[PDB]
Amino acid sequence: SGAIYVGNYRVVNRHLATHNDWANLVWEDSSRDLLVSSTTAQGCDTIARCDCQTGVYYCSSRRKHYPVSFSKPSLIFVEASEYYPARYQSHLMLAVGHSEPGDCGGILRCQHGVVGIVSTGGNGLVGFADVRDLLWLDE
């Protein structure tokens, strides 16, 4: 689990959104596994606006942050799970690193701020849903 809190927005994995996130929906895209809902309080996360390919991610199944190299956002085939059938997920970045299903939501950050959140993984990989192209999170 986990979210990004920027301005009056809450960014979560769409598969982990609550009934309240849907009532307060701003934008969602199943093909990206993202959902953004509105908040009453102002958030303090800064979103990165960059092309960094190295950063640090939080892994809740190890209670540890790991430095990683990751691929640029792209269309990647993601195996079936209890939340989606097998499909291509867009804006996805992959890295070699530990991840378990409950690690979705962990932040990936670079020197510029938040890059994205854990969204896919397995077999020694970890995938992150990019948020750096969502310029409107800033206004």
Ligand X SMILES: CSc1ccccc1NC(=O)N1CC[C@H](C(N)=O)C1
Query: Which window, 22-30, 34-42, 44-52, 100-108, contacts ligand X (CB under 6 A)?
Result: 100-108
The β-bridge partners of 67 are 56
Footprint (CB under 6 A) of ligand X, residues 11-70: 15, 33
Query: Which window, 4-12, 35-43, 44-52, 80-88, contacts ligand X (CB under 6 A)?
Result: 80-88
CB of 125 to ligand X, least distance (A): 8
Element housing 21 (H / E): helix 19-23
Distance of CA 117 to the CA centre of its chain: 2
Residues near 123 by beta carbon (within 8 Å), at least 6 away in sequence: none
Half-sphere exposure in the Cβ direction for 118 (13 Å, CA)? 27
Where on the chain is the footprint of ligand X (CB under 6 A)? 15, 33, 78, 81, 83-84, 89, 99-101, 103-104, 118-122
Q: Active-site residue numbers?
A: 15, 33, 104
Binding residues for Zn(2+): 50, 52, 110, 112
